[PDB]
Amino acid sequence: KLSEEQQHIIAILLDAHHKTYDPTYADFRDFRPPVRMPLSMLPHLADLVSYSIQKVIGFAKMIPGFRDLTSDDQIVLLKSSAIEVIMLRSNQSFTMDDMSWDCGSQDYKYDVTDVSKAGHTLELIEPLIKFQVGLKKLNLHEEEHVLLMAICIVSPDRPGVQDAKLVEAIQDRLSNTLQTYIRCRHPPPGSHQLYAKMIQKLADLRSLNEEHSKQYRSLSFQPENSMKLTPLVLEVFGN
Amino acid sequence: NHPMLMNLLK
Numbered sequence: 001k002l003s004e005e006q007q008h009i010i011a012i013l014l015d016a017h018h019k020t021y022d023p024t025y026a027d028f029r030d031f032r033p034p035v036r037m038p039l040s041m042l043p044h045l046a047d048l049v050s051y052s053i054q055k056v057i058g059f060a061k062m063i064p065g066f067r068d069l070t071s072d073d074q075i076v077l078l079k080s081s082a083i084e085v086i087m088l089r090s091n092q093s094f095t096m097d098d099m100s101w102d103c104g105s106q107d108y109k110y111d112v113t114d115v116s117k118a119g120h121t122l123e124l125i126e127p128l129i130k131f132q133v134g135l136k137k138l139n140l141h142e143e144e145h146v147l148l149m150a151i152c153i154v155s156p157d158r159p160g161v162q163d164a165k166l167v168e169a170i171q172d173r174l175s176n177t178l179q180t181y182i183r184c185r186h187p188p189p190g191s192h193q194l195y196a197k198m199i200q201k202l203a204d205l206r207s208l209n210e211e212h213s214k215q216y217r218s219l220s221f222q223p224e225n226s227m228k229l230t231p232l233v234l235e236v237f238g239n
Numbered sequence: 240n241h242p243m244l245m246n247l248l249k
């Protein structure tokens with residue numbers, strides 16, 4: 001059932017993730033320092049997000065079929081998916097011991113109060129925590145984790161897509177790979193309705209995307225706040 | 240329009 005091409009796809013996505021995710025979190029020392037005291041966490045979290053957008057781009061470039069698209073379509077897909085892929089990939093450091101993102105040290109252990117000290121409200125933070133918990137409870141294999149990130153990126157219904165037919169064909173190769181992987185390698189009971197549960201998480205991400213863009217647009221409208229963002233964040237999330 | 244995204248996608 002799991003064809004040789006499908007095993008190839010999984011191998012590439014695993015390697016792409018390993019080359020774009022550093023579980024030592026050593027680069028966090030280059031960010032502007034976190035200040036927990038005003039939006040005191042905006043500079044650190046802006047650098048953290050900007051750093052992760054770069055990692056998301058590096059992963060997306062290695063998705064089988066992604067570079068067959070036009071440059072315009074690659075840009076639309078990454079602009080619309082970046083915040084969602086960051087939410088997905090940040091689950092690797094999320095802990096249910098205390099509902100925090102543990103990135104190796106106390107300075108880099110982030111909770112709900114750090115998100116609020118970047119300007120965001122419970123309208124986003126509450127559904128964000130529920131999403132992180134529900135995704136962690138799925139206990140995805142690393143193979144399913146990287147497949148879900150790739151499917152999120154290559155979605156044909158994103159606004160501004162030109163060749164939606166080509167985007168769908170690429171995602172279909174990935175969706176069938178995931179569906180077959182669950183039916184051959186994920187033992188029950190963990191596999192029960194697992195594909196449908198993962199597709200529900202993509203729907204949850206669309207709603208989280210909308211609320212983040214809403215709060216981002218209000219935060220970035222004040223020039224004092226935009227001044228603390230990075231050039232890449234302004235290009236991807238909006239100016 | 241998106242020169243930094245474009246360059247990282249190169």
Ligand SMILES: CCC[Si](CCC)(c1ccc(OC[C@@H](O)CCC(=O)O)c(C)c1)c1ccc(OCC(O)(CC)CC)c(C)c1
Nearest residue numbers: 020021022045046048049052055086087089090101110118
């Ligand atoms: C930190 C608080 C929890 Si966050 C939840 C996840 C989205 C998070 C946690 C860990 C993490 O990175 C860890 C590895 O994944 C990278 C390792 C690697 O790739 O090597 C990242 C990237 C994000 C977060 C941060 C900033 C936010 O807002 C920013 C603005 O909207 C504020 C105007 C725009 C700047 C939001 C809404 C959420």
